Structure formats: C-alpha cells, structure tokens
C-alpha cells in the first residue's frame, strides 16, 4: 500500500517534526497538495529533532511524507490514530536498510493546534 | 478509565516530545516507575515545543505522564500504536478547560530509538 | 474524556459488531445522531459475537456507543485508527468491574464497506 | 514493509473475526508460529462476517494474517492499537484489485479475552 498519505481537513494548521535514528543522513520532504512545502535534513542515532514547523493543510487537505537518504528512498510505514473524536496523529515510520526498526526517520504530524 | 500509562519493554531507550496548544502554562511531568524523571514547562499557542529527551524506561517499564495548569490536573487521553510489529507510538492529548481538543499538552513518546 | 463517540462521513453505511468478554450480560447501546438505531446484548466470557449489524451515518455523521451490565453503565475506552488513509475503526473497549480489562464488551466499527 | 504479523504475549488466548467487502471470494489464512490454525473462505460485498475464532499464540506469540483471492494475494495494510494500557487490537485490510479500499477483507484480532 502507499504510506505517508494523510487526508486532512482543508485549510487547517498541523504541526510536523521530524526524528533521526541512524548513522545515515535523513532528508524529509513533506509535500502539501503535490507541492514540496518543507525539507528537513539531519543525523542522529539518539532521537534527534531534525524538523519542526508549523504548516497549513490547503484546498485538498492532502499531506505527504517523503524520506530519502542521499536520494535513495526509505521504505514507509504509516497510520492516523484520533483521540477524544478531535485529537489526530498521522504517524510515519521510515527503513533506510535492512533492521526493520523503521525509526531511522519518524515523522509525527498533529492537528488541530491552537 | 486511566490514561496516560503506557508498559514499555524493560531498560529501553525512548524519545518523549511535549507540545503546547494553550493560552494556559504547561507543566508535563515524566514518571518512570513512579520516580519523576522530566518535567517541562512552557505555553504555546502554535504547538512549540516545551520539551524533548531521551529516557531509559527501567526495569519495570512504566512510563507515565502526568499534565498540570496553575497546579490543577489536566483530564487525559491517550493510546499505544504500533507500525510494522516494531515501531511504537505512546500518544497523550490533555484539556486544561472546556472545549475538549485534547491538544492543550500534547505528548508524544516513541520507541525504539537508534 | 468522553469516549465511545465517533464523527464519520455523512451518508455512509458502516458495519458495527460487538463481543462480550464478562460473566454479565452486556447490552450495548449504538446511536446514529443521538438517536438509537440498534440494540446487542449477550452473555460470553469467550469473545462470543453478541451482534453485528450494517447501519448509516445520516446527515451529521455522529456515532455513539453505550454499555451497561444490568443497567449499570460500564466505563469505556475509545480510539479511531485509519489505515492506508482509507480503512477506518472506531475501536471501544468496556469495563463493568473492577479488573480494568476493558474487554467486557469490546465494539469494532468499521468503513467504509462494499 | 511486511504487513499482518503482530506478536502477542505468550499462551494467550485470542479472538480472530474476518469480515468480506468484495465480489470476490476471500481466502483468509491464519498462522501461529508459523503453521496455519484456521482459513476463513467466504464472500459478501455488504460485511458479513466470515469467521470468527478463539485461538492460543502459543510459545513464540507470533500471529500471522495472509489474504487470496483465487489463489493471488491481496495487498495488506495492518497496525496494533492498545488501549488502557491492556486492551489490545490486531487490525488488518486487504485490497484484492484496484480501488484502495482495503476492505475487502477486513481482520480483527483481540486480546485479551474472558
Ligand atoms: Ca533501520
Ligand atoms: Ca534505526
Ligand atoms: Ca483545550
Ligand atoms: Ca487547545
Ligand atoms: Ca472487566
Ligand atoms: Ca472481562
Ligand atoms: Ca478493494
Ligand atoms: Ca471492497
């Protein structure tokens, strides 16, 4: 299955951040509507925050994540979760080798904020 | 029910990230096998970031997160998801008030890491 | 928090289906728009099906669950996970005592369907 | 990533309840450590259940969910959700053709039971 894909709500703020896990250099793209809207590039095998920020859903409310090293993509695991019928998590987990701890970069993007 | 206890694998790293979503001041307390082991403080409208840090869960692995405003208890949800039998999620919402978007302290703990 | 509360699209047709898991019997209680739709109760400590039925969201979308044990309202737990950002559960566990499984009835809501 | 595996806790009893939403027949596969323990084979486009089990994971806890439709497998789409800290789902979807709705067969797994 395609990983990575959210359907938000149209026009609406979320938060994404960005985690490392691997001697690899990870780069985040998150794409809004088909368009690269922030790109986040770190190291780290302790956690890392690598990216913060604060981004808008748009028209289409479709978010997706990306994440390469040195180009090469990673293989994606993903799912949304809803506390309280308000509280959304769209989570993503990332391989960039063979261990299968999908780690290597998480991605956790949440709304509504404010 | 009780929420905002989660039973990790014993003497495992993880990542705990807090987040602010209030007019209110956060405090976001970490308890590892009841021994408060973080406390982060911060307010935030726009989902700043009040904390991050990567704890070891101890022998027990139990991890609670406990959420105060002005030293009043803040009511909690939260749930465990895990992504491709290995990549775990440990996700807390707070309301410090009335409106009911659980996102006043928002906490997130992730594992493994490295 | 409220639990047992869900928001799904309107007009849609989802499946509802509840177990039991407790020496009482448990009556679940299942609203469309606040208005009751269906009815399942049942006795089973072995995960027996105590009904399972196919309904619609109506205009508002609104879906609520209830359980009591001889008209004692049981706690519950709730969440919604949505996979492949298209398959969605709203989950309920329910506790009628005091052992916190919060398996005593255990209501699985699903779409979209066909 | 590999999909429909989850590792339970040892010698635990468990349920498996299948549901069909597809014009397709479904063949549903069950292994616990690695030997089939049930096959589900059945047909309905409106979400009729077509099995249900209570089972044991046995030793090494590990459950596997496979999905075909004559003879082809589907794609599968999974995640674990726990609830309470104690109530736990094993959640698949399958897609046996085009459309992405991961629900042409549906797998619900629950523990623990009683
Ligand atoms: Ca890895
Ligand atoms: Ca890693
Ligand atoms: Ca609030
Ligand atoms: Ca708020
Ligand atoms: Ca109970
Ligand atoms: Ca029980
Ligand atoms: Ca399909
Ligand atoms: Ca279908």
């Known amino acids: 299955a395609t990983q990575g894909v959210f359907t938000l709500p149209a026009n609406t703020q979320f938060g994404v951040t960005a985690f490392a896990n691997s001697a690899g250099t990870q780069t985040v793209n998150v794409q809004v509507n088909n368009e ?3 790109t986040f590039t770190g190291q780290s095998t302790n ?7 604060v981004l808008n ?13 040195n180009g090469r993509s990673s293989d994606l695991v993903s ?8 509280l959304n998590f769209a ?16 991605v956790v993007i949440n709304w509504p904020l404010g």
């Open 57 to 69: 859903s748009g028209g289409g409310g479709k978010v997706q994540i990306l994440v390469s090293v």
């Open 91 to 106: 989570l993503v987990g990332s391989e960039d080798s063979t261990d299968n701890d999908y780690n290597d970069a998480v």
């Open 36 to 38: 690269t809207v922030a």
């Open 47 to 53: 956690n890392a925050i690598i990216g913060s920020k």
């Open 79 to 86: 799912a949304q979760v809803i506390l309280a019928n308000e």
